[PDB]
Amino acid sequence: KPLVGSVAPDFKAQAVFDQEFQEITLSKYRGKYVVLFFYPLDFTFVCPTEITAFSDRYKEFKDINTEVLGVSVDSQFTHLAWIQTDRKEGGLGDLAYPLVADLKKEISKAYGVLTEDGISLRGLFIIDKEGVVQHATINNLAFGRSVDETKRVLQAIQYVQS
């Protein structure tokens, strides 16, 4: 019954990568660890430090066979405009990993983070090479996601599986 310990619900969605549109399938990433995270909405007045921190430190995750995937319920087109908007004027700047458009709210619903208001909560899941969910962190409010702690829990999971 619990999402942690079970096989990660698969998905096919539009994403922006290297400022172009492509189709992403979660199970195409098997053989690799995935850090899948949800944030409510693009173009808010909340500083997007939860997305940009992972972009600036993306190299540390590639170098340990981890991909990173960000998800909100905004369209591929909203993601792309937010990525081409500078950090200084409320944007994201270039982004090193895919930003997923959950336009039908099926990914947020499947992972248990969709609220009645039509947006996901703040939430992170670490998925193993065989596609099993080994960790979930879910936040009702905007405070720090520590990138140091995300990486610690992820190295703790790699250690225990080898």
Binding of a second copy at residue 137 (CB under 8 A)? yes
Question: Helix, strand or coil for residue 94?
Answer: coil
Instruction: Give the separation between CA 119 and CA 102, rounded to whole angstroms.
Output: 10
Catalytic status, residue 79: no
- Looking at 4, 7, 47, 156, which residue is catalytic? 47
Binding of a second copy at residue 144 (CB under 8 A)? yes
Sorted by sequence, the CB contacts under 8 Å of residue 154 that are 6+ apart come out as 33, 35, 61, 64, 66, 126
For a second copy, which stretch binds (CB under 8 A), given 48-56, 61-69, 92-100, 139-147? 139-147
Instruction: Give the separation between CA 147 and CA 162, rounded to whole angstroms.
Output: 23
Q: Which stretches of 29-144 are assigned E, i.e. beta strand?
A: 33-38, 66-72, 99-101, 122-127, 133-139
Site string for a second copy, 52-91 (x = CB under 8 A): ---------------------xxx-xx-xxx--x----x-
Q: What residues does 99 pair with on adjacent strands?
A: 16, 70
CB of 141 to a second copy, least distance (A): 5
Binding of a second copy at residue 99 (CB under 8 A)? no
Sorted by sequence, the CB contacts under 8 Å of residue 20 that are 6+ apart come out as none
Binding of a second copy at residue 114 (CB under 8 A)? yes
For a second copy, which stretch binds (CB under 8 A), given 27-35, 51-59, 60-68, 116-124? 116-124
Residues that bind a second copy (CB under 8 A): 1-5, 41-44, 73-75, 77-78, 80-82, 85, 90, 103-105, 112-119, 121, 123, 132-144, 146, 149, 152-153, 156-157, 159-161
Among all residues, which ones are annotated catalytic?
Answer: 47
